[PDB]
Specification:
monomer; mainly alpha; T7 RNA polymerase, domain 1; Helix Hairpins; Alpha-Beta Plaits; 3-stranded antiparallel sheet; 32 helices; 55% helix; 8% strand; globular; binds adenosine-5'-triphosphate; binds magnesium ion; DNA-binding; RNA-binding; transcription; viral transcription; DNA-directed RNA polymerase; DNA-dir_Rpol_C_phage-type
DNA sequence: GAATCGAATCGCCGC
RNA sequence: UGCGGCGAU
DNA sequence: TCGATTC
């Protein structure tokens, strides 16, 4: 209802608390302490205003129950409501006479679905509708109950398997009106197939819809004291009305909770002084003692955070503190360019003036619908990044606090950060530059070639590309609005940032102070790291771990492999055959042709397979994708765009072409990156054995409990993997699904063990690289995006060294898979040792060759 | 045990 | 939390 | 397609 303002006492404290002010003043003066504390004050005040506007919107739209402030209320109210409507059924079944009107209607819908639909629509009508009458509420319940009753039988019974293909398309619909209108078309569709038993819904008359909710408000009042009954002008047969009113104690409960949440979600802005050095778990980054302190590790529970207060990880704490100390400044030159073209185009790069029938128009309709959502979503994030960039444009330097996710990858904390998109990366440059010199100018050109998309080509031709395009780079720097060439590039705003620094060198020579971050992006991190542990020679060569004759394109290597299978299958492949295929719901038994590998090879060679067909499949390998997931990928990535554009005529049956290509890609990656495939299988089997509760079937009691997965990275960071699942969840078709120590989810443990392990290794590599570049060399400024390592051009050659030396030091010292085995080997039940796979065999790779690989980049 | 389901992390915006 | 959309890796 | 979860 009426939320307290938290700012009058709580948000004033962060500016006036004298312990945080003094610790900030002692480091960077009292004046910068006053601006920084007032900025963190604005960050909390902006965050309270963000909550109050979203709360006001949910108030008008009746979605107050969807807000977090009403959730713990409804959690303690739902058991009492289900039991009253349950016990009322048993009473009416025992009472003689005719059943009440509502009794038959309340049965077809799930009883827990009654409880939520009544609670949500009561506070929807009591907060937005202004009509507090018992009839407008009770009817509004009854229409919402009939909607879940009528279209719920689609989800529940007569099409539960067929529900799985309409469920996604219903989720894409935005709005309860659009979700219902879509449900009307599917209902008419299945009834034409006789799927819902051939029984069409008889719509409830307006009298019963009120009678359903009237009993529902009564059962709400009988069970809980959420709403109280009121009668006005009693006895007057013309004015006798009944209204309902929210209990003031419960409206006070949501207002107190909403005020508490408003002071808890801030809008994290950059720092005008260097960030608070992390000494412990909390309170780092920002300097003030706020209501939400920054956690060093972003954990989903406060218990998983508490395990980090005992551990001694001095090398971990150093690397975040060094990465915090890197002073950035807003690139004013690209800010001048971005400020004008954003006023003319929605996206400044999206358009540039350069040189089965019914399912098709449905597919194009879903494309312009998603693209309409995509353009409005892309623009609002752009307008915020531009406002933050224009805000801190005049400051001599700004700083970003850093923490880490529960695996150890480091992330900046502020919303505007150097880990953003191409434009956000372009608006941000380092502040403390050095004279560029010969080596820095060389790497500045290599960075400019990478921004243009010329990264598949060895270094001398990258320099040649820049030198050939000298007059175009100079024209873009002199007049960026008159020469749109930089906008046509792959990373356009970061490329234009290079153009300004390139022109600055041609003007002021090699003594030019350049503070541009020069990012070195390692090729495929997970495969690089997986091939490093098990020492895969061919796998490392595929990801440029080895010094190669040229830049190795792993997608092109896999595309080369599938093309060799394609040519062999076009000759010696299987012919076509006719198989009987039955769809179980229809029950039909028809004959369809099954393309053999000879025919399917001829289709794909007619399409012409390149690195683009195999690209996304290789990239999602470290996330766990295998032969199934490739089949879905190549269907929507290459086959479906082909048939939409006029190609794909060779794909007579596209799912057979997808599954055939899926098989072919999987045989190719599995023999190209053998150490990647073997290591994720070893981690998956380890997490499977730990996530299982063992019990002898003749004993029953559990001999071993659900065990989590635990390891420590080589720089000392520990990580607990404990995916947990709730026990009860409920979903509604037209309304949001709401919930009703906890068990470990064995599937998510196995699904996530291999990506999180290799992500923890690359975060340890990024952490170790930051300290090695800072203590062996004099590097102070760091651009870090998990995969990419960037610094000023003068320090670029040394960061190029340090990112290589760390990986070969890490894997020469620690066998990360053998140390992983030493963690869980005690936790294994005696019946599981025979099933546990052995450690994969080490290969012929020399780690020292990484030190002389140009294209590892990292 | 036959039946049934599944096929990485982080942040922002909306419902 | 879930769902939709965007971005980063 | 194929083995873990889950009726
Ligand atoms: N590390 C990553 N993991 C998964 N997807 C990624 C990653 N980096 C980028 N993408 C996605 O890949 C697509 C763009 O591919 P991108 O150009 O970045 O690939 P690449 O590895 O540089 O290859 P190439 O230069 O051959 O195109 C986008 O959908 C982007 O979101
Ligand atoms: Mg690229």
């Amino acid at each position: 209802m009426n939320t307290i303002n938290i700012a009058k006492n709580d948000f004033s404290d962060i500016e006036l608390a004298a312990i945080p002010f003094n610790t900030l003043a002692d480091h960077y003066g009292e004046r910068l302490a006053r601006e920084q504390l007032a900025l963190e004050h604005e960050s909390y005040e902006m965050g309270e205003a963000r909550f109050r506007k979203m709360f006001e919107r949910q108030l008008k739209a009746g979605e107050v129950a969807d807000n977090a402030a009403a959730k713990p209320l409804i959690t303690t109210l739902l058991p009492k409501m289900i039991a009253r409507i349950n016990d009322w059924f048993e009473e009416v079944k025992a009472k003689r006479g005719k059943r009440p009107t509502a009794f038959q209607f309340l049965q077809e819908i799930k009883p827990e679905a009654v409880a939520y639909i009544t609670i949500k629509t009561t506070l929807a009508c009591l907060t937005s509708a202004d009509n507090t009458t018992v009839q407008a509420v009770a009817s509004a319940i009854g229409r919402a109950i009939e909607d879940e009753a009528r279209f719920g039988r689609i989800r529940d019974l007569e099409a539960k398997h067929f529900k799985k293909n309409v469920e996604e398309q219903l989720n894409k619909r935005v709005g309860h009106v659009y979700k219902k209108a879509f449900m009307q078309v599917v209902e008419a569709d299945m009834l034409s197939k006789g799927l819902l038993g051939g029984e069409a819904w008889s719509s409830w008359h307006k009298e019963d819809s009120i009678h359903v909710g009237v009993r529902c408000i009564e059962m709400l009042i009988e069970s809980t004291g959420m709403v109280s009954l009121h009668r006005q002008n009693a006895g007057v047969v013309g004015q006798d009305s009944e209204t309902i009113e929210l209990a003031p104690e419960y409206a006070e409960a949501i207002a107190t909770r909403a005020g508490a949440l408003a002071g808890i979600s801030p809008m994290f802005q950059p720092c005008v002084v260097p960030p608070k050095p992390w000494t412990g778990i909390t309170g780092g980054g920002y300097w003030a003692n706020g209501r939400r302190p920054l956690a060093l590790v972003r954990t989903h529970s406060k218990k998983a955070l508490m395990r980090y207060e005992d551990v001694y990880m001095p090398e971990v704490y150093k690397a975040i503190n060094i990465a915090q100390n890197t002073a950035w400044k807003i690139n004013k030159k690209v800010l001048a360019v971005a400020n004008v073209i954003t006023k003319w185009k929605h996206c400044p790069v999206e358009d540039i003036p350069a040189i089965e029938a019914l399912t098709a128009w449905k597919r194009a309709a879903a494309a312009v619908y998603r693209k309409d959502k995509a353009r409005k979503s892309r623009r609002i994030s752009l307008e915020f990044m531009l406002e933050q960039a224009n805000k801190f444009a005049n400051h001599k330097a700004i700083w970003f606090p850093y923490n880490m996710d529960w695996r150890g990858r480091v992330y900046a904390v502020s919303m505007f950060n150097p880990q953003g998109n191409d434009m956000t990366k372009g608006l941000l440059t380092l502040a403390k530059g050095k004279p560029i010199g010969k080596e820095g100018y060389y790497w500045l050109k290599i960075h400019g070639a990478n921004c243009a998309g010329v990264d598949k080509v060895p270094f001398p031709e990258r320099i040649k590309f820049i030198e050939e395009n000298h007059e175009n780079i100079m024209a873009c720097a002199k007049s960026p609005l008159e020469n749109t060439w930089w906008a046509e590039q792959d990373s356009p705003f970061c490329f234009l940032a290079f153009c300004f620094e390139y022109a600055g060198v041609q003007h002021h020579g090699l003594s030019y102070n350049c503070s541009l971050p020069l990012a070195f992006d390692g090729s495929c991190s997970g495969i690089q790291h997986f091939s490093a542990m098990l020492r895969d020679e061919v796998g490392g060569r595929a990801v440029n771990l080895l010094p190669s004759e040229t830049v190795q394109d792993i997608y092109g290597i896999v595309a080369k492999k599938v093309n060799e299978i394609l040519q062999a299958d076009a000759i010696n492949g299987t012919d076509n055959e006719v198989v009987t295929v039955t769809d179980e719901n229809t029950g039909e038994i028809s004959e369809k042709v099954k393309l053999g590998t000879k025919a399917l090879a001829g289709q794909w060679l007619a399409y012409g397979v390149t690195r683009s067909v195999t690209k996304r499949s290789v990239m999602t390998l470290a996330y766990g994708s295998k032969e199934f997931g490739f089949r879905q990928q190549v269907l929507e990535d290459t086959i479906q765009p082909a048939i939409d554009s006029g190609k794909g005529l060779m794909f007579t049956q596209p799912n057979q072409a997808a599954g055939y290509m899926a098989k072919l890609i999987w045989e190719s990656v599995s023999v190209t990156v053998v150490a990647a495939v073997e290591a994720m299988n070893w981690l998956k089997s380890a997490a499977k054995l730990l996530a299982a509760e063992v019990k002898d079937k003749k004993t029953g009691e559990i001999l071993r409990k659900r065990c989590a997965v635990h390891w420590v990275t080589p720089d000392g960071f520990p990580v607990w993997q404990e995916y947990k699942k709730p026990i009860q969840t409920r979903l509604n078709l037209m309304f949001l699904g709401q919930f009703r120590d906890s068990e470990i989810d064995a599937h998510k443990q196995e699904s996530g063990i291999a990506p999180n392990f290799v992500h923890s290794q690359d975060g340890s590599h990024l952490r170790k690289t930051v300290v090695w570049a800072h203590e062996k060399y004099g590097i102070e400024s760091f651009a870090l995006i998990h995969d990419s390592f960037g610094t000023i051009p003068a320090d670029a050659a040394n960061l190029f060294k340090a990112v290589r030396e760390t990986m070969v030091d890490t894997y020469e010292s620690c066998d990360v898979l053998a140390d992983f085995y030493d963690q869980f080997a005690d936790q294994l039940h005696e019946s599981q040792l025979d099933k546990m796979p052995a450690l994969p065999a080490k290969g012929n790779l020399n780690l020292r060759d990484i030190l002389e690989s140009d294209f590892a980049f990292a």
